[PDB]
Amino acid sequence: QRYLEEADRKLRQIEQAYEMGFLTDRERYDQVIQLWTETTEKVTQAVFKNFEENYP
Numbered sequence: 001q002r003y004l005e006e007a008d009r010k011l012r013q014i015e016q017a018y019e020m021g022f023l024t025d026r027e028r029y030d031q032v033i034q035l036w037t038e039t040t041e042k043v044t045q046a047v048f049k050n051f052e053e054n055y056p
Contacts, residue, residue: 003042003046007036011032011035014028014032015028017031
């Protein structure tokens with residue numbers, strides 16, 4: 001939950017960038033894509049660590 005909500009805030013961030021002119025469409029796209037990529041990485045790592053720490 002925590003991480004996803006963070007990634008949601010960051011999503012808004014990227015959106016604002018795109019609206020400010022600092023980003024074009026495709027780099028906003030790429031940034032969103034890598035954000036969700038590393039978010040998937042995040043939750044995966046969190047899953048394995050949660051298994052190892054709590055229920056081996």
